Design a protein around this ligand. Sequence first.
Ligand SMILES: CC(=O)SCCNC(=O)CCNC(=O)[C@H](O)C(C)(C)COP(=O)(O)OP(=O)(O)OC[C@H]1O[C@@H](n2cnc3c(N)ncnc32)[C@H](O)[C@@H]1OP(=O)(O)O
Ligand SMILES: CC(=O)SCCNC(=O)CCNC(=O)[C@H](O)C(C)(C)COP(=O)(O)OP(=O)(O)OC[C@H]1O[C@@H](n2cnc3c(N)ncnc32)[C@H](O)[C@@H]1OP(=O)(O)O
Ligand SMILES: CC(=O)SCCNC(=O)CCNC(=O)[C@H](O)C(C)(C)COP(=O)(O)OP(=O)(O)OC[C@H]1O[C@@H](n2cnc3c(N)ncnc32)[C@H](O)[C@@H]1OP(=O)(O)O
Ligand SMILES: O=C([O-])CC(=O)C(=O)O
Ligand SMILES: O=C([O-])CC(=O)C(=O)O
Lengths: 279, 279, 1037, 279
Amino acid sequence: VPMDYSWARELGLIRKPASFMTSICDERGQELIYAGMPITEVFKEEMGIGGVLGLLWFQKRLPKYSCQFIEMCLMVTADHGPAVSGAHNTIICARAGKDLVSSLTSGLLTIGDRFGGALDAAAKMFSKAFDSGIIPMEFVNKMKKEGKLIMGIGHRVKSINNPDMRVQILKDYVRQHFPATPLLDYALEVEKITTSKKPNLILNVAGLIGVAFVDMLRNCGSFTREEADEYIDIGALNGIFVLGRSMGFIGHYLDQKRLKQGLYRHPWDDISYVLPEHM
Amino acid sequence: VPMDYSWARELGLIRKPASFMTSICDERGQELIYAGMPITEVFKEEMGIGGVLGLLWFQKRLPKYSCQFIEMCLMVTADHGPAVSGAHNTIICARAGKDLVSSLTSGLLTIGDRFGGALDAAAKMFSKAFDSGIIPMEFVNKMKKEGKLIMGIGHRVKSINNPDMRVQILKDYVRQHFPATPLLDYALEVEKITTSKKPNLILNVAGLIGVAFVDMLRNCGSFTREEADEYIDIGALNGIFVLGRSMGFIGHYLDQKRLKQGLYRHPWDDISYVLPEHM
Amino acid sequence: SAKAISEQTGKELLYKFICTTSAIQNRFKYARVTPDTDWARLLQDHPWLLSQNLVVKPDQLIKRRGKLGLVGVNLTLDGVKSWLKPRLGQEATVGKATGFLKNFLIEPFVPHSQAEEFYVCIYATREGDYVLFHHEGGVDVGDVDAKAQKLLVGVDEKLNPEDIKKHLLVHAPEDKKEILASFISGLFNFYEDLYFTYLEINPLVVTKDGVYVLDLAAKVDATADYICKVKWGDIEFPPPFGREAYPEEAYIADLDAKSGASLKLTLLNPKGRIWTMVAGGGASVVYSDTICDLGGVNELANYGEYSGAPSEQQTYDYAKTILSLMTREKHPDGKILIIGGSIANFTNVAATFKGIVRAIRDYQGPLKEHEVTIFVRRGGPNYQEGLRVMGEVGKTTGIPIHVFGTETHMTAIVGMALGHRPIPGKSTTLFSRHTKAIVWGMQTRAVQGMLDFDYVCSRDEPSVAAMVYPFTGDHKQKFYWGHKEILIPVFKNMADAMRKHPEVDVLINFASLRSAYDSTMETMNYAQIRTIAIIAEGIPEALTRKLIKKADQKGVTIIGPATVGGIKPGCFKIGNTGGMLDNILASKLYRPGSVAYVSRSGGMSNELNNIISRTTDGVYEGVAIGGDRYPGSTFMDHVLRYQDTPGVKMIVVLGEIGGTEEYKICRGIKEGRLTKPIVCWCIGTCATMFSSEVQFGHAGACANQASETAVAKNQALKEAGVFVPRSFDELGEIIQSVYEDLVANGVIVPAQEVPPPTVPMDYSWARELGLIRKPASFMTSICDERGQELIYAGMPITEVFKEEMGIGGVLGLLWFQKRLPKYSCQFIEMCLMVTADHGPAVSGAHNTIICARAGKDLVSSLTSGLLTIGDRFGGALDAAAKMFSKAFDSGIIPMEFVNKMKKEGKLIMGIGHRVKSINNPDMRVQILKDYVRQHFPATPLLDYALEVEKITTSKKPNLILNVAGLIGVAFVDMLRNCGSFTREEADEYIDIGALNGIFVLGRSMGFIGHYLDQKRLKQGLYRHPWDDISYVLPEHM
Amino acid sequence: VPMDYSWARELGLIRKPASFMTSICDERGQELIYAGMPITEVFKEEMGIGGVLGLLWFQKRLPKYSCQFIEMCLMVTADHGPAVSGAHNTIICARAGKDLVSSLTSGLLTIGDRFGGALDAAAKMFSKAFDSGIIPMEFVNKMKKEGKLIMGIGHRVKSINNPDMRVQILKDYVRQHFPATPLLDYALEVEKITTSKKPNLILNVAGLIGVAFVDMLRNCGSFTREEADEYIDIGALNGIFVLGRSMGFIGHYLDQKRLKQGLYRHPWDDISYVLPEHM
Ligand SMILES: CC(=O)SCCNC(=O)CCNC(=O)[C@H](O)C(C)(C)COP(=O)(O)OP(=O)(O)OC[C@H]1O[C@@H](n2cnc3c(N)ncnc32)[C@H](O)[C@@H]1OP(=O)(O)O
Ligand SMILES: CC(=O)SCCNC(=O)CCNC(=O)[C@H](O)C(C)(C)COP(=O)(O)OP(=O)(O)OC[C@H]1O[C@@H](n2cnc3c(N)ncnc32)[C@H](O)[C@@H]1OP(=O)(O)O
Ligand SMILES: CC(=O)SCCNC(=O)CCNC(=O)[C@H](O)C(C)(C)COP(=O)(O)OP(=O)(O)OC[C@H]1O[C@@H](n2cnc3c(N)ncnc32)[C@H](O)[C@@H]1OP(=O)(O)O
Ligand SMILES: O=C([O-])CC(=O)C(=O)O
Ligand SMILES: O=C([O-])CC(=O)C(=O)O
């Protein structure tokens, strides 16, 4: 009878390398641990979604204002109606009678450059401009001469004297709670220049969240500059938008299943057919 | 120094249970093997996609007519235009500039009961009717009194003197090549009864493919009745539709990328907003 | 627009920025005294006041100060002290203007002789900058244009130090020729790099010590603010003497500078009872002339205009500013608000009138108590909706509002408001039917209007061949050719567009003022483009002169900036000219006529379109050359074209105040070059009746001399033989009389009226009119993105945050459309917190980690993990809730439920743990259970599940309530025991999968954390080891 | 009563732009049309999966050898065992009892740069080298000096005297049937240089398929150079790999459901836990 692998490991007789590494959650043991913190201690220390997210995404005990800011970001990105690409896809999959997971996933797969990536894009653009040391006017001119529109700038209806009211809540929280907001100040200077061009070139929710998240990361004491830069590069802000919008997509799925909408077919009048004469 | 796991396994001193089982493909070894059959021999037997699918899905060497019929089924399910739910979702995800895999997956997640499940549904319905021993008229009456529509029956415009033209090719192939078609004959009797009701209640491409696939499975010598029943139960026909329509979904993605279509946002005039007064 | 700056500001800029080898004296050595200044403070911040003698003169843009006794010389500190108060803060009358003395300047006295009184002036012209120098300057300068040395410096030409001693310094003293020339060169550099348009130093004194600038009058191109921002700093533009500045004027000026639209407001008489809301500079000018033609000049309160398609918000801000200004004092006779305008070309009348009516609703109180009567005349895009909403506000507020449309002559609401009428080389042919244009910028509405015009004109091909937009990649844009759908290419670069479309001969530049110069300069590098239309307003005059010089060199016709463009009925239309297709059909601009016109204004050009269509055969060609000081092409440039064009039979010129341009037409008629009948009216006659120097909306609308007044121009044209109406009222009649007398002689043979091709109505317009019915394909009840504020299930987002709900409250709103209690929202949050992650070994976390190590993506990795959420993994929440709800609703006791599940071969969902049984519980079940038992009002299903747990643990210890079981039963309890849901609603939510949603949303946090962890650790591609896979392939299939 | 939108469109009284464009399939009409070509004629010309794929992906009537080569590419990319990332994910999702679509989709979402993207990577890399005009030795040295491995080069065990036997089949077909193989000849020259280094750097199946697909696109008469370049840029080879491996992923799902494997949990001994001491 051959030696039992588990019982050989128990005596430490053999060496089998572990193929996986994790640092965010320990399920083994008498107590569940979130990045070194017991779940009961998680609940006595009175964090919520923001604190749990800080533990699970950054392995940090964020300050209460940081945790609350993360919560508000999730609340403001929760939904933006059924007409966007992801909500449209989720509704189509729900009306196909498919599944909650399948419908939400179908909607989420649209999250990318054109839809839902402006948070990360604005964060990266403003961070690069701030770190290069160029002044906001030079940054605006450089984007204009490079044929690029500033990510996180520009609104559809709302302008100066017609505040977004989602940007205002987050901005007011950031000014009254964050210790320092250098990148937010830089982005506000850029916004002043762009609104001097045409009124609706205001800081978006995407731009506000991106710059405020970068400011939180590199101005709260939990992260070094390298850590904050790495998290921005690997996509913590993409994760923020995805987690926020999943709430709205699940709401849309539940809405369609309660309304008991049937299978959707796109009308032919809305499709232009440009097939070749004969291939 | 503790003993090496791999080298202790080579000496056969320890026992570690394998957590996975597979029977369709052997990647290791001098030659790639598809269900016991070398890849060079796969190409020497001049089989194609249908034969490779037979190997990889059923671990069987199907006859040439069976493999050719599988190929024709994939050919006829390849696409049905951009208005269906899956193609719509794929096009939305492509116009969001996302990715080929993400776009195709977004479209594929709609494949289920209401869209793309009629193949399996019709196969199961007709198999159950044929196995229960009831005549086609009794089957029609039982479905009528149970408040269920016969899946795989009923077209939109093409009824008679103008058939599906996709049902016709497949039915002609099955007639000329399949040895016996008991469930197909049963489905055709059901179709005669339903067309005696109103002309457009004809055997759909979904119904024809489902009944002909059950016929191929349980009338070619490769499978026993239990095996054919198990394959129908676990979803070989869902697999057939998914694989066939993947070709069309990828074509739709490539078409949108070539046409360079921008981000789609659903018009507000097409959405009815029925939010509550204040919640 | 050239704005005069104060002497202090000009001297400060000169001292700060001039670069001369000459030792400029008294640098930053001047004193400003005002009534609100402290003399001790000035004495201790400017000590030279005691060091030398003084000179004092006001700095309120008063000229001729020497001979009106406003300047005091050779008087000390005590002298200026005794000298100011008898004049400081007093009343002075210069010309027709009178005003206070709130600003004075004190400078050192310069001891100088009459032999060193020099005059140096630099002023801008179309062909360049003229530099005048006089050796006998000062008071005795006399005539300057005939006795002072003149020297033109052309556009893009440097004023070299030589040729100044040759042309400008013939009579200069030899001992001071060199330093004088150096100073003049430095002064020209100062003039050119700070975008001065006028710079007169009189007198200039140069002693052995150095050069003294005793005085200077300077006008600066205010539109160049975006260029000279750091050099000007906070440059201020004083109002003309006799006018006091107002915060409302400053607010409107800031609003105007903040956008590409035009917003002008000038307060002439705050006590006046006539107020105007006129769209368009030319329309505002003609309304002003009409008001002062009926004797309302004394009661005219403001001159104002809004142009450039202002937004709803901008129009609201403008309207509310004027409404607040109108509701300050009270007039016994009441007050009048003239909301006028021409027929707009592209200004959204609906949006602008929505802004105005919002302001009217906001001020309906003071407006009603002020007896304000509103007269409205307007036409343009969507004017029916705007007239409708203003009429509605007129009754929903009580304000007497009389709205009229195009059928009114637009100089009629003035008559019925003031109580006078009852209230009811360069080519000749720029465009043809084969003209192809390239549009710079995304102007899809403008391009579509162009295509609609081409279709109703029976053109073979669309007039727009390509579009250029540098902020996107090359693609094809979808447009309408009648009812057919066509694709128009869009290019990132000019070069690609001109490469692929060599047949294009016209550019329509929709670039802003900051991009128009560069785009036009780049455009004139292609010889195929023969006409460029520049739409942007606010381009600096120096840049426009550069464009003019290059276009003249290249033989390219430029339809000057700040123009709507032009229209040639039957052949071609520039941009938004002529408005939308309904106006094109109303003015019959799809077919040629015989009257060609040139105008400065665009809206006035649409008015001309309407008038000519009504009174004559029609329009052959109409060009608006723009309101800028230097148009790309002038009046004569187009009148010559029309005279040389055989299809036109009479010419209509709509001139303006300022610029001796109509005198060229007079000379052309005198020399016999112009022979066809010409009908001209020059607008701006009210400036002669205004006791001030008000600047109109147009940049060029400024009478610099006495011959550039509109009255003088109209008189000169009348003596030249041009048919000149008595006013803009009689323009239609004189055009009609000329057309009739030209028809009766057989000169004009009107053609048959062939009906135009029909264009289908737009779907959006038909929906707005409620003409058609299209069922909505989608239904939503959870979020309303449209509107001013985002709404989550009927409750605004600001209210969401003010009520202090968090994720739990937002989730209640978005998932159930209920305002859940605080404990319910908090419990939802804790459920999400406890389902957040359970390590990397579960199926979903494993799949997510695999996809992350495949280097894939956050969304793809999370989605790969989420697709495992189902029956075997992640579905125990819903399964336990459904099982326990069914058992509890069946009425069977927990023991019966346990026996039943045992006899059906089913394990109880949500029962059974791995290690933690009793005396050591889950520590997650405990937290949630303690919260539920402390905050939930009633927990019947939780009590039932606890009884079931008591039996299962009577069987074996680890059969305890799981986190899944406890969350399921507690969620059902919350749904059906908080007051928000009925039993049917709670059952439906449980059936459709709210608990599946809870688990999915909770575990998404852990899956994203796992993805980020793998990316931080930089784990490579995973491959499952072969020793862990059992291969059971058949022997040979 | 307002006019019906469909009635107003039929009368041509209103204009509503179509928000979607398609050029690959016409579902409306008496017959289904694949890129301008009727389905009955599709089956009459005796093309199969390869011809249908040519129609749906490129809107071209490819030559018979091109269609057959596309079929062989799909056949050789069908499966490579259960150990790869996508098959592993599919097997996990199937053992979670989930669904065919969900399981296949879970496996497919791994298709990207590290897994399954070598086809497109090799095609793009060799195309750039061939178009730049540098000789194979210069290309090899250039990739060496930029510290990049040549995509499509390098095998695990099979180098010479025992080649891949999939590369051999595809290469023999390409040599016998393709009119010209310039990029293939270039890649074989590169492979000779790399095998002069040590034998195991041979032309991979990924490299062979990439270069042979580029050769087919730009050497069959159906495409111009711009068209072939655009198709390679937008991801026809990614589509080829995805469609080929979907058959293997569905086979793996069906295999797991036939073997009735339970829920998988990764062993704790294979995971290294590196959580922080206390966050
Ligand atoms: C997530 C965020 O907060 S923003 C995300 C993007 N972030 C960026 O900053 C991207 C960079 N910035 C930009 O490119 C631009 O400034 C934009 C796109 C953000 C600004 O958008 P705009 O082009 O001004 O307007 P948008 O394209 O959203 O709206 C199109 C028009 O159709 C209308 N419209 C919008 N959605 C719909 C709909 N579903 N149905 C019908 N009409 C609609 C709107 O009224 C709008 O009209 P208007 O803009 O002329 O008033
Ligand atoms: C898609 C394709 O065709 S390959 C991708 C193409 N990309 C490129 O070609 C880019 C450049 N090429 C490369 O990166 C490299 O040449 C590779 C990765 C393709 C070749 O890698 P190699 O290190 O030569 O082989 P690989 O990493 O696949 O396998 C290494 C060894 O592990 C063994 N092995 C492979 N998979 C497993 C498994 N699941 N369990 C246990 N052992 C395994 C192999 O037998 C091989 O054995 P050896 O030690 O006797 O050589
Ligand atoms: C979401 C939830 O709350 S769980 C789902 C709830 N659903 C139900 O309640 C359904 C009914 N209940 C049941 O089916 C059962 O009671 C279960 C599955 C919940 C409990 O099953 P058990 O057999 O007690 O434990 P489980 O199957 O989890 O694993 C048992 C052993 O595997 C070991 N194990 C678990 N995970 C791993 C891993 N990743 N690696 C190695 N070993 C492991 C444990 O150490 C345990 O050993 P022990 O029993 O000697 O301590
Ligand atoms: O094929 C049909 O007729 C039904 C259909 O649109 C699809 O599900 O593909
Ligand atoms: O939470 C548990 O105990 C069971 C588990 O692993 C999961 O589904 O996440």
